[PDB]
Design a protein around this ligand. Structure first.
Ligand SMILES: Nc1nc2c(ncn2[C@@H]2O[C@@H]3COP(=O)(O)O[C@H]4[C@@H](O)[C@H](n5cnc6c(=O)[nH]c(N)nc65)O[C@@H]4COP(=O)(O)O[C@H]3[C@H]2O)c(=O)[nH]1
Ligand SMILES: Nc1nc2c(ncn2[C@@H]2O[C@@H]3COP(=O)(O)O[C@H]4[C@@H](O)[C@H](n5cnc6c(=O)[nH]c(N)nc65)O[C@@H]4COP(=O)(O)O[C@H]3[C@H]2O)c(=O)[nH]1
Ligand SMILES: Cc1cc2nc3c(=O)[nH]c(=O)nc-3n(C[C@H](O)[C@H](O)[C@H](O)COP(=O)(O)O)c2cc1C
Ligand SMILES: Cc1cc2nc3c(=O)[nH]c(=O)nc-3n(C[C@H](O)[C@H](O)[C@H](O)COP(=O)(O)O)c2cc1C
Ligand SMILES: [Ca+2]
Ligand SMILES: [Ca+2]
Ligand SMILES: [Ca+2]
Ligand SMILES: [Ca+2]
Lengths: 394, 392
């Protein structure tokens, strides 16, 4: 089946310039018998290629292209089935954009391509070509944020308690500063939140979730919570199904030597969106009391910015699923970059969670993320503050 | 009950400068007895004001401020309940940002206010860093524009179980019609609800699919030429027949249309409710060469995370985000993020439901170039309606 594949990449700046003549000649020669057509764009610093052909032919070729030493930061932009070849023709063409003025390069593309009966601008491939021509440097990863320039540099369990908590740091690597700690519930045997709640009767789960937080506050109070923030996780129902959950939390966090402004409630985006009715009175009370709110798991499931017209949280936590393979995904890059910007405009804090690799950290930072949470920096620490690994140069 | 209200605005650059010392002195003196506090930031062009007080007091005060001819382009950025007063003991106070070096204004703020973990503070910082971002440019002032009158030729067609009205999606910059949307109508010319209410509940998906034959017929006999055509379809209509896509292909071809010329609009909510099933249908549409749009984007709550799952050719911003976008910083921020994301992904964006020059001008300022609404063109029963263009 005819498939389209579009990616962008960049050259190595400190290495000799790539021989584009040898590249394009061997490309067009190899592509012809395999039925692979398209076009290569080059602006001096970045490549942008369109590839058309069978699914299996492009999968094979793109694997080789990903392994190629002549470029790096290969970012996939589009991959879809196609009704016709836009670049009919027997050879990989190259367009050196440095030789064209304002809109001469688009003019040049329409000499070797057709985009159906309607205006070319109605075609996604053409719009992507235009965007790279207009401003290809936008998602060009800066030199200082190249992963290769970076490298990475006790507590007891409490079985007698009906539940215990692990603390994971949210960090700001640019200031080597810990922003806050998230409390994650653990079972008496050190099990996961799934195991903990599975051991509780379905009819008592909401109440348990709320009441478990007294132990999270006690832990934070015993630890030097020196002006750091404490995030806790609650389901909407846990706050909702209680005559006064806000007052309950208030009394509990007050007793533990904490302040209202120091406690942030994380609620999953999926379960907040599904019950707008009940949530707003609870959210209001949380606000008036002075506690902060975060929208958790932002990007996972059903999760949008239109939510923000109804109410605006203090913080949004970008889900690990958008963080996964962000370095190779143009789609995730564009979404995360857009969320970051919207949050800046609205004065909402953004945290990228589930950060496991320097690649993720570098690319997340390139689109404006400054607060991070993940195994790269600090893993959850049962009943204590874990060690933090900071990225350092070389 | 304490409330916080924040807005940004702009001076009239052609008019004499306002005496801000007098304005602020009068403001501070009036505000404090009424239990109102806050600050005013000025960068030479724009104002940024924080107001704290009861819901009643800020409502009354903001109404006056909105009517004040000393400024324009008043955009509300925040209105929410507050736990405490940030500017206790300060009726009103102006910080002229041109009198400060980097972070000087912010540092002074902290000395008389009562930090990066507060939304008001982050907004203050954001205005100081890049206050001009959502400043409406001078050429895009509604006063610098005027809608011109265009005749339509609507016809009632008999021998049909349904009819279709056509509404143009336009690109005002190029005085160009991008596409026409087919909107189903009853045999008597009534609304979609009226049409579907006369069909048995169980026959609605089938009827929705089969009705598209008459939309293709209308487009074909228009003639459509090189223009695109939205139809609308529910996912269930597309699931109704095993080869619904195959049937659409035959019907559009017989009407003298091309696959790449036909675009299927599916509502945001109905797509996410079934990722299952939809992918097989989407696959067939792409292979056949028809295009897909996500309609009512921002109504199904909603957003850009769906783009990891598939990506449509087009998204159409829901009318709720369009409404009063000129006075809502929140809608402005959301619409701008959708525009920027879709631009990066090469997805066309249409602002739907545009009724005023104010909406059009502000949508244009956040990057939208394709528009659908009564401002430009109303739905025309079985025909191409008249189009109005804004002129400078
Ligand atoms: N793969 C990967 N994972 C990372 C990384 N960094 C952190 N994580 C983990 O991802 C989860 C983050 O919490 P969450 O997204 O709020 O998702 C949490 C949260 O929803 C939750 N949860 C935790 N405590 C509570 C609670 O007290 N009440 C409720 N309702 N839910 C809770 O259960 C979910 C699963 O929790 P956890 O087992 O604690 O697992 C944690 C955590 O340890 C990373 O770099 N890579
Ligand atoms: N206030 C205002 N309204 C504006 C403006 N511009 C356009 N509209 C209108 O908003 C609707 C736009 O179509 P929609 O969002 O798809 O919303 C449509 C669409 O969902 C729909 N529909 C139309 N045809 C079909 C169909 O064949 N099948 C299905 N399933 N739904 C259809 O029923 C809905 C109701 O459609 P309509 O009466 O045609 O109403 C149209 C339209 O006339 C404006 O500037 N201001
Ligand atoms: C920007 C870029 C574009 C490329 N395009 C193609 C191409 O279209 N066709 C191709 O066969 N190889 C292409 N390559 C080269 C492949 O990565 C790889 O070197 C080649 O397929 C190896 O096959 P060979 O040794 O049998 O010639 C490209 C490499 C880069 C850096
Ligand atoms: C940028 C801006 C900020 C203003 N802030 C206040 C204010 O905080 N308090 C106030 O009473 N009037 C404020 N005003 C003035 C009001 O719009 C209005 O002129 C005044 O409240 C009328 O009341 P008066 O008749 O007692 O003067 C502001 C005007 C502008 C242009
Ligand atoms: Ca969480
Ligand atoms: Ca998560
Ligand atoms: Ca529609
Ligand atoms: Ca709509």
């Amino acid at each position: 089946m005819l498939t389209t594949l579009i990616y962008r990449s960049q050259v190595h700046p400190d290495r000799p310039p790539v021989d584009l003549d040898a590249l394009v000649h061997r490309a067009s020669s190899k592509n012809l018998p395999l039925g692979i057509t398209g076009i290569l764009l080059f602006n001096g610093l970045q490549f942008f290629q369109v590839l058309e052909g069978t699914e299996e032919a492009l999968e094979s070729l793109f694997s080789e292209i990903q392994s190629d030493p002549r470029h790096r930061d290969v970012v996939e932009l589009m991959r879809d089935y196609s009704a016709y070849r836009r670049f009919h023709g027997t050879g990989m063409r190259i367009l050196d954009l440095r030789l064209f003025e304002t809109d001469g390069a688009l003019e040049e593309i329409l000499r070797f391509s057709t985009f159906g009966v309607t205006e070319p601008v109605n075609d996604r491939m053409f719009r992507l070509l235009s965007a790279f021509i207009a401003d290809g440097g936008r998602y060009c990863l800066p030199e200082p944020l190249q992963p290769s320039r970076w490298m990475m540099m006790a507590p007891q369990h409490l079985p007698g308690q009906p539940c215990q908590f692990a603390l994971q740091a949210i960090v700001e690597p640019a200031k080597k500063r810990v922003s806050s700690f998230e409390a994650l519930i653990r079972s008496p045997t050190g099990g996961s939140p799934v195991e903990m709640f599975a051991a509780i009767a379905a009819e008592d789960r909401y109440r348990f979730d709320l009441e478990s937080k007294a132990y999270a506050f006690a832990l934070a109070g015993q630890l030097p919570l020196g002006k750091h923030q404490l995030a806790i996780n609650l389901l909407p129902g846990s706050l909702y199904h209680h005559p006064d959950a806000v007052g309950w939390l208030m009394d509990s966090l007050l007793a533990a030597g904490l302040r209202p402004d120091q406690v942030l409630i994380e609620v999953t985006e999926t379960e907040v969106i599904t019950c707008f009715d009940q949530f707003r009175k609870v959210l209001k009370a949380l606000r008036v009391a002075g506690m902060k709110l975060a929208i958790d798991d932002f990007g996972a499931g059903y999760s949008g910015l239109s939510l923000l017209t109804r109410f605006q949280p203090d913080k949004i936590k970008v889900d690990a699923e958008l963080v996964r393979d962000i370095h190779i995904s143009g789609t995730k890059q564009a979404i995360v970059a857009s969320v970051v910007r919207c949050c800046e405009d609205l004065g909402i804090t953004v945290v990228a969670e589930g950060v496991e690799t320097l690649e993720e950290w570098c690319w997340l930072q390139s689109v404006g993320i400054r607060l991070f949470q993940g195994f790269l920096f600090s893993r959850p620490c049962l009943n204590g503050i874990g060690e933090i690994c900071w990225p350092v140069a070389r």
